[PDB]
Amino acid sequence: ATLATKKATLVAALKDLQRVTVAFSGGIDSTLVLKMALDVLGRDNVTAVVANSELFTDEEFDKAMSLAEELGANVQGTTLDYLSDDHIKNNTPDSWYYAKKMFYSRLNDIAANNGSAAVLDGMIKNKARSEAGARSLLQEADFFKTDVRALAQELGLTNWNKVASCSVSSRFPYGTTLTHDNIAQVMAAEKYLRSLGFPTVRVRFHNDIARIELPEARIGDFLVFNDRVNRQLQSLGFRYVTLDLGGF
Amino acid sequence: ATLATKKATLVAALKDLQRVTVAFSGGIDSTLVLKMALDVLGRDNVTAVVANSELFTDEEFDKAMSLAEELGANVQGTTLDYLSDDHIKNNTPDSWYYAKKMFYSRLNDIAANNGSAAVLDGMPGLKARSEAGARSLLQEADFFKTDVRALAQELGLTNWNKVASCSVSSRFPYGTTLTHDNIAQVMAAEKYLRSLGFPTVRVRFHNDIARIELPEARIGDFLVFNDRVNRQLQSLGFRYVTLDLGGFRSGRMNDTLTKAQLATFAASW
Amino acid sequence: ATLATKKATLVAALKDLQRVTVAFSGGIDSTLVLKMALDVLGRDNVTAVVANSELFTDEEFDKAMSLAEELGANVQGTTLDYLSDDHIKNNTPDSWYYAKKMFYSRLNDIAANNGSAAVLDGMIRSLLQEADFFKTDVRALAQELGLTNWNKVASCSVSSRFPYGTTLTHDNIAQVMAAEKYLRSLGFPTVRVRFHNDIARIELPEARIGDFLVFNDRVNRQLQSLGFRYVTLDLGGF
Amino acid sequence: ATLATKKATLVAALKDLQRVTVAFSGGIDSTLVLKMALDVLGRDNVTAVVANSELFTDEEFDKAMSLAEELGANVQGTTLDYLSDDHIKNNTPDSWYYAKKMFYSRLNDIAANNGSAAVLDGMIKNDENDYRPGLKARSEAGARSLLQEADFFKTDVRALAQELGLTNWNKVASCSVSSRFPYGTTLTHDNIAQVMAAEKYLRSLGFPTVRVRFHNDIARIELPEARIGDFLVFNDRVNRQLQSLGFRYVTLDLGGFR
Amino acid sequence: ATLATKKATLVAALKDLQRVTVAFSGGIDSTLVLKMALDVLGRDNVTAVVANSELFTDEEFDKAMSLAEELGANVQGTTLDYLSDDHIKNNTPDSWYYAKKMFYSRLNDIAANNGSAAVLDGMIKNPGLKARSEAGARSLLQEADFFKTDVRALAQELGLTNWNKVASCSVSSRFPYGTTLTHDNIAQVMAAEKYLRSLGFPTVRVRFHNDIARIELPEARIGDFLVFNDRVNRQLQSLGFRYVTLDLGGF
Amino acid sequence: ATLATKKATLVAALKDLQRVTVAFSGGIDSTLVLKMALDVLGRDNVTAVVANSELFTDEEFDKAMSLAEELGANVQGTTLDYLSDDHIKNNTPDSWYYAKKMFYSRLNDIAANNGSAAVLDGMIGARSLLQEADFFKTDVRALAQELGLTNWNKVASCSVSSRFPYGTTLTHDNIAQVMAAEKYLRSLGFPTVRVRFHNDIARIELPEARIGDFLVFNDRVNRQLQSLGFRYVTLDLGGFRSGRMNDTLTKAQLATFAASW
């Protein structure tokens, strides 16, 4: 019922586990888990694992790896072939579930081979995890979003990913099959738009059509880049480069 | 040579035919032929025919019909079912040819049944004009674009369509099947945009996506209508309503370097 | 005149007091005061109080209450009835003064009953100002204690959206407050909806007026449903 | 039927009236009436009348007078006192009626004192009420609207006007300045001048279609929504200039012009 | 006097000349002169002449050529080398006079060689009038006391609707009086303006300040221009400018 | 490889020098250097030196002075007369080098007279310990966050020489004219701006993402910079740092255009 009591619960579960493997995204939640795991169990009893895959960009992978090193953790990257699963490859509405299922399976094999007693993730109290037996100790300790912020300040944590990343699957219609090329073309398209000063952007893939989603308050400033964005996204493989009048 | 020879050639060829049926678009070229037919042959020996179909809007048909009456011609409306032809229904790159062929076939049937000696116009197989026997006396008289203007002013011609019409098939990709509903959907979307003050517009059909083409100089003014256009075309059946950042007739206004880049990009499809 | 020397004076100042009640707005300044009060005097000798009233939004009240607890403070809500004062109710040019009197009277009244030696505020008793904290010193020291979360948008009393002389009502306040919250949700954090009966006069920073065009029709219809008959934008800006 | 048939009706109606007085506003409709009257009856049996008043701008009055002379008409200016009628003075919803009556009453006296058989105006099928737009223009049993009798629509007015080579007219349809004041608000020489000077300034920046709605200390500017994007570069100049004209707040209506 | 009396004067003056050469710019004045010459003397006795040169755009020449042919006139293009005269090339305030002098001299040679009794221009009653009188050209609109009101009234009476309404201006105005005109900087300014007009901005000037282009647009159009910033920048640099700028004062 | 390994190098390099003098501009790089220097050597072994001159604004000098002292450094003002050097006064393409020579010459005299073992600067006789420790721009920000550094100059400062063409002589009047014009533009909400001086022509460079917002200010800027002495006030259609955001083809073309001057 108090932050001390919630932090006490978390420390006790970590002390009980002894050795843990932590799924590290770089957000505040996984940052808080990894820093309490290091403080309670020591550097030699925690392994931070960062997933690298086709559904996320090299930038977020590099940023998550370096943040984990900045916390003083031993960090290990692992690559998942999400496109090997037909639910992900053909993008069904259940694609995220099979991606999380494949991710947590790899984490258990790492945890089994480094002697960890559990895989830890960042999930707090607001499926594929429970099937895997991973533990969300923040959620077991009744951490809400405000308690994550309070404890992060108490431990002097200031640096984490403030932008929540989302799988590139969301830029493709459910029917659409994801390939290594159209994913890369979508990823380069969003990265270019971001470099113009639009941090919140989506390039929705509709075969030959790119449908760009921007916050509507930014579209007026965007006009100066229309021609450059058009030709650049066409060089990336789109035939039509369009702007959604509904916005982001 | 002389414009007097361009008109003399035309006058002699019309006096030659005695009775004619004229394919009337409402454009300057067909306007000019129709009034030369009337002046040379009289009302009782000219039949103006204006096509009505699903590939063009009711506005231009009603506008073309009244203009032919304004010239003093006896006018005939005929309705064509272009979608009965599978080349048109399935929007092949040859669709224009089968549309013209079906049109000239109906004109030849109308002319045979009224007493005309020829069908007149303004300008995969045999040429749809020549296969049917249609005569383009303006081109036979070697009229250039300015001479049509020079003779049209000389004859006091004032009301005609300066807007070049284009078949609604052009808003669908090659291969896409045209339906009565998606045609109506495209037509209502473009008419809505014109009512907001954008006379030059295309709503390109990509199934669930509408791709709007506007002149780039107008896109800044267009933002005030984004939300209204989005919701209006969604009520018309589109799921996503988008604006093409290349504009209407992309590349027509780019610099020399990026005009050739946009050209070779389109040369891949 | 170093941040280390400024913080020592501030820590020492609090130390003398022993027990404090802190006027907590949720901004960076009062957040730094409250967490130095907590660090120096302990949680049981600090009372953070957040004022709620008709002149400020429920959102900033809820946000200030949660932020003070996030620092680990015991937090107390207090409700002020500003409209009970006839100077405030009729929006006189001196309305601010009678509002401040009611505000500090209530905090002094809270401080008297919890044993506090003084009421503290965040102004740049203003111990931040006495220690010569500039805006640059607040940012460095708040980060130094790991503070990242605070209310960055400074609130202003809703009285400013009504002409002097106009009687303030719960409905005209609610109408103005709802109009501003809608506009902020469109991506315009700095906005005023000036109330002129049938006319809403929207003030935006001039650098943002270009971005606003895409929202003209939606803003027009939304504020008409809120009770305005005409919805207008001031060409002079904010 | 055909535009030729509509014009034949008009020619016959003019030949039957022999001598006419034409209420000339300078718009497309009034230009077509005035120039067919001149073409059929000759300059000696047509009197063009252009109204000058406090409710319309001197600019369009000067333009209409020059156009009527340019058309080859004998044109006559007459100044009306709309504000003399208290129904117009106090801007009631029925103000249009007393303005139209006073306007047509003056025209009938001009027609009575020359040899004209009828007052003609520019009113077509559909059309808008010039004092109160949004009330469909209609009737007037004391005047003849030969365009409306011949079933001229707006499209036929263009077609026949181009056919006669008419190019110069006022393309923006004018509306009485009464419409810029709320119902109940009393019209003054100062607030009219204040609104008229404000619209005249806005028109000089390249906005021919504009309304400066008067709300005492508040100016509420109505522009066509398609033009509001162009307006941004003029915000500060318009704010200052309309403030010097007496407004305290200068605002832009997010709904745009009607 | 009445417009009927002025038109009678105009008709009688043309009837007396029998065969004429008309300097045709495409404006209201030159269109009215050319049309009355055709109406009074017939197509076989009128020659329309349109000047082509480096100081004006090919677009205005082509439209002027097309207008004369539309009126039913036999129209003839003639090319003038204005920069061969140093008074013009050095861009002095009197350069326009030497341009007009070279123009009327060529018109006199055309009229001398086709049998015309006079060169006619569009000038009216109320300048570059001195060059006209020295060359003996005739402004019949001004002799008949046509004012602007009479020109417009008669153009309506003859059903004339189409003429060039935008007044063209010599490219010298895009260079300061100190700068001497060369064929390359003229070509550079003309290509830049021709590109800008192609984007939908008919009213534009590209003022030449050596390495700097200063673009003048009507202020009401500057908002529309933003989408073209990058394309205009690189195209005018490829034309030789180092900086491409937009004047915040407008046109 | 790791930020920890680079910071260890940085800590060790400072310990060896024992006492250092830091050239402090207020940017992220020098703020980082000064704060690691203070943490490793203590306030008594590092003196912060901020340059004051006619080529930079009083605002940039005061902010560097307030930031260095707030971090706990002993801060020292030194005034440089850059315009006394004809390479700077006449703005040659190598002018920046003679400005750096005159500044680093003054820093060495302070370093000789305070007992410092080296002059330190922010680069990634002078020592750039960030560059020796293999700090890239990303490592500067990551480590600057680690020490809680929040206040630094986010808009990069640049000598006013850059607003004048090569060959043009700098005067107090044209410098003041450029500084007054940029300060006015900054007050309208454009913190990143350049007013390039071309005698009677002002050429304004803004970040392209901001040019859409600028239209509302056209007339005010035109009149205000005209009162400052310009005859024509213009906006550069390439923007600030042109070509940096263009597409692959037009970034290459603009780099060709820029290379021909």
Gaps (C–N > 2.5 Å) in chain F: which residues precede them? Answer: 124
Distance, in Å, from the CA atom of F111 to the CA atom of F96, rounded to the nearest integer, reads 22
Instruction: Classify residue C216 as left (phi > 0), alpha (psi -120 to 50) or beta.
Output: alpha
**How many CB atoms are located within 10 Å of the residue D141 CB?**
6
Q: CB distance from D159 to chain B under 8 Å?
A: yes
Residue E145's identity, in one-letter code, is: D
Q: Which residue of B has its CA nearest to C212?
A: B224
Nearest by Cα to C231 from D252, E144, A73, A154: D252
Q: How far is D169 from chain B (nearest CA, A)?
A: 18
Solved by what technique?
X-ray
**How many CB atoms are located within 10 Å of the residue F48 CB?**
26
Residue pair B23/B33 in contact by the 8 Å Cβ criterion: no
Classify the C-alpha dihedral B92-B93-B96-B102 as positive or negative.
Answer: negative
Instruction: Give CA separation, F116 vs D223, F41, F46, F69, in Å.
Output: 69, 12, 8, 19
Distance, in Å, from the CA atom of B53 to the CA atom of B81, rounded to the nearest integer, reads 6
D181 and D248 fall within a common domain: yes
Instruction: Classify residue C203 as left (phi > 0), alpha (psi -120 to 50) or beta.
Output: beta
CB contact under 8 A, B223 and C214: yes
Q: What is the resolution of this structure in A?
A: 2.6
Q: How far is D48 from chain E (nearest CA, A)?
A: 16
Residue pair F89/F83 in contact by the 8 Å Cβ criterion: yes
Classify the C-alpha dihedral F248-F253-F256-F261 as positive or negative.
Answer: negative
In sequence order, the β-bridge partners of residue D222 are D211
**How many CB atoms are located within 10 Å of the residue D2 CB?**
13
C108 and C195 fall within a common domain: no
A142 and A175 fall within a common domain: no
**How many CB atoms are located within 10 Å of the residue A100 CB?**
18
F169 and F253 fall within a common domain: yes
Nearest by Cα to C120 from C228, C41, C222: C41
CB contact under 8 A, F216 and D235: yes
End-to-end Cα distance, chain E: 40
Residue pair E248/B242 in contact by the 8 Å Cβ criterion: no
Residue pair A36/A152 in contact by the 8 Å Cβ criterion: no
Residue pair B72/B22 in contact by the 8 Å Cβ criterion: no
Rounded (5°) CA angle E87-E91-E97:
55
**How many CB atoms are located within 10 Å of the residue E128 CB?**
14
End-to-end Cα distance, chain B: 44
Residue spans of alpha helices (H) in B18-56: 28-41
Test mutation, D248, D254, D257, chain C, max C CBs within 10 A: D254
Burial profile B204-243: b = 16 or more Cβ within 10 angstroms, e = fewer: bbbeebbbbbbbbbbbbbbbbbbbebbebbeebbbebbbb
Nearest by Cα to D39 from D65, D67, D10, D63: D10
E67 and E17 fall within a common domain: yes
Max alpha carbon distance in chain D (Å)? Answer: 58
Instruction: Classify residue F157 as left (phi > 0), alpha (psi -120 to 50) or beta.
Output: beta
Tokens of F223: 């009149």
Task: Tell me whether strands C46-52 and B46-52 are parallel, antiparallel or unpaired.
Answer: unpaired
B183 and B133 fall within a common domain: no
So which residues of E are the catalytic ones? 169
Give the length of chain D.
Answer: 258
Cβ contacts of residue B109 below 8 Å, gap of 6+? none
Task: Tell me whether strands E243-247 and F20-23 are parallel, antiparallel or unpaired.
Answer: unpaired
Residue spans of alpha helices (H) in B46-123: 58-70, 86-89, 95-114
Tokens of E125: 């009653």
Distance, in Å, from the CA atom of C146 to the CA atom of C37, rounded to the nearest integer, reads 15
> Which secondary structure element, helix H or strand E, spans residue D161, and what is its range?
helix D154-163
Cβ contacts of residue A75 below 8 Å, gap of 6+? A24, A47, A48, A49, A50, A65, A68, A69
Residue pair A198/A231 in contact by the 8 Å Cβ criterion: no
Grouping H, G, I as helix, E, B as strand and the rest as coil, residue F192 is: coil
Residue pair F47/F21 in contact by the 8 Å Cβ criterion: yes
Tokens of B144: 């250039």
Helices and strands, number each (H, E), in chain B: 12, 7
Tokens of D193: 């001048």
B252 burial via Cβ count (<10 Å: 0-12, 13-18, 19+) = middle
The CA radius of gyration of chain F, in Å to the nearest whole number, is: 20
End-to-end Cα distance, chain D: 33
C20 and C51 fall within a common domain: yes
Grouping H, G, I as helix, E, B as strand and the rest as coil, residue D251 is: strand
Residue pair B128/B141 in contact by the 8 Å Cβ criterion: no
D144 and D188 fall within a common domain: no
Residue pair D99/D85 in contact by the 8 Å Cβ criterion: yes
Backbone φ and ψ for F121, nearest 5 degrees, come out as -125, 180
D192 and D151 fall within a common domain: no
Residue spans of alpha helices (H) in F42-187: 58-70, 86-89, 95-114, 129-132, 137-146, 172-187
Name the DSSP letter for residue B210: E
Distance, in Å, from the CA atom of F227 to the CA atom of B76, rounded to the nearest integer, reads 71
In sequence order, the β-bridge partners of residue D74 are D47
3-state DSSP percent of chain B in helix, strand and coil, to 5: 55, 15, 35
Q: How far is B69 from chain D (nearest CA, A)?
A: 7
Total domains in chain B come to 2
Name the DSSP letter for residue A165: P
B220: chain E residues, CB-CB within 8 Å: 223-224, 226-227
DSSP letters for A8-68 = HHHHHHHHHH-SEEEE--SSHHHHHHHHHHHHHH-GGGEEEEEEE-TTS-HHHHHHHHHHH
Task: Tell me whether strands F232-236 and F201-205 are parallel, antiparallel or unpaired.
Answer: parallel
Residue pair A186/A205 in contact by the 8 Å Cβ criterion: yes
Test mutation, E207, E230, E231, E241, chain F, max F CBs within 10 A: E230
C216: chain B residues, CB-CB within 8 Å: 224
Chain centroid offset of residue F145 CA: 21
Provide long-range contacts, Cβ within 8 A and 24+ apart, for C77-80: C77/C49, C77/C50, C77/C52, C78/C49, C78/C50, C78/C51, C78/C52, C78/C106, C78/C107, C78/C110, C79/C51, C79/C52, C79/C53, C80/C51, C80/C52, C80/C53, C80/C106
Classify the C-alpha dihedral D174-D177-D178-D180 as positive or negative.
Answer: positive
**How many CB atoms are located within 10 Å of the residue C11 CB?**
14
A246: chain B residues, CB-CB within 8 Å: 227, 230, 240-241
Cβ contacts of residue B21 below 8 Å, gap of 6+? B46, B47, B48, B49, B107, B110, B111, B114, B116, B118, B119, B120
B117 and B184 fall within a common domain: no
Q: CB distance from D238 to chain C under 8 Å?
A: yes
Tokens of E241: 């400018």
Gaps (C–N > 2.5 Å) in chain C: which residues precede them? Answer: 124
B6 and B69 fall within a common domain: yes
Grouping H, G, I as helix, E, B as strand and the rest as coil, residue C18 is: coil
The CA radius of gyration of chain E, in Å to the nearest whole number, is: 20
**How many CB atoms are located within 10 Å of the residue B127 CB?**
13
Choosing from B141, B166, B191, the residue where a domain stops is B166
B146: chain E residues, CB-CB within 8 Å: 66, 69-70
Residue pair C188/C204 in contact by the 8 Å Cβ criterion: yes
Give the start-end residues of each E strand in chain B: 20-23, 46-52, 74-79, 118-120, 202-206, 209-213, 240-244
Nearest by Cα to C14 from C41, C34, C35: C41
Q: How far is E78 from chain B (nearest CA, A)?
A: 20
Grouping H, G, I as helix, E, B as strand and the rest as coil, residue F136 is: coil
CB contact under 8 A, F235 and E223: no
Residue with tokens 């960090």: A75
Domain containing C213 equals 157-238
Q: Which residue of E has its CA nearest to A225?
A: E227
Distance, in Å, from the CA atom of A44 to the CA atom of A38, rounded to the nearest integer, reads 8
Instruction: Classify residue B115 as left (phi > 0), alpha (psi -120 to 50) or beta.
Output: left
Classify the C-alpha dihedral A125-A127-A129-A134 as positive or negative.
Answer: positive
Distance, in Å, from the CA atom of F6 to the CA atom of F230, rounded to the nearest integer, reads 49
Q: How far is D166 from chain C (nearest CA, A)?
A: 39
3-state DSSP percent of chain D in helix, strand and coil, to 5: 50, 15, 35
Choosing from E131, E147, E169, the residue where a domain stops is E169
* Neighbors of chain F by Cβ distance (3+ pairs < 8 Å): A, B, C, D, E
Q: CB distance from B245 to chain A under 8 Å?
A: yes
3-state DSSP percent of chain A in helix, strand and coil, to 5: 50, 15, 35
Test mutation, C6, C145, C190, C206, chain F, max F CBs within 10 A: C206
Distance, in Å, from the CA atom of B211 to the CA atom of A212, rounded to the nearest integer, reads 12
Choosing from B146, B166, B186, the residue where a domain stops is B166
Side-chain half-sphere exposure of D84, counting CA atoms within 13 A:
7
Name the DSSP letter for residue E175: S
D197 and D157 fall within a common domain: no
Tokens of C115: 């044993």
Nearest by Cα to B136 from B36, B58, B254: B36
Cβ contacts of residue A68 below 8 Å, gap of 6+? A24, A26, A34, A48, A50, A75
So which residues of A are the catalytic ones? 166
Classify the C-alpha dihedral A189-A191-A197-A203 as positive or negative.
Answer: positive
Nearest by Cα to D100 from D76, D124, D128: D128
Backbone φ and ψ for E47, nearest 5 degrees, come out as -125, 115
B261: chain F residues, CB-CB within 8 Å: 249
Q: CB distance from B188 to chain E under 8 Å?
A: no
D225: chain B residues, CB-CB within 8 Å: 224-225
Distance, in Å, from the CA atom of B80 to the CA atom of E165, rounded to the nearest integer, reads 43
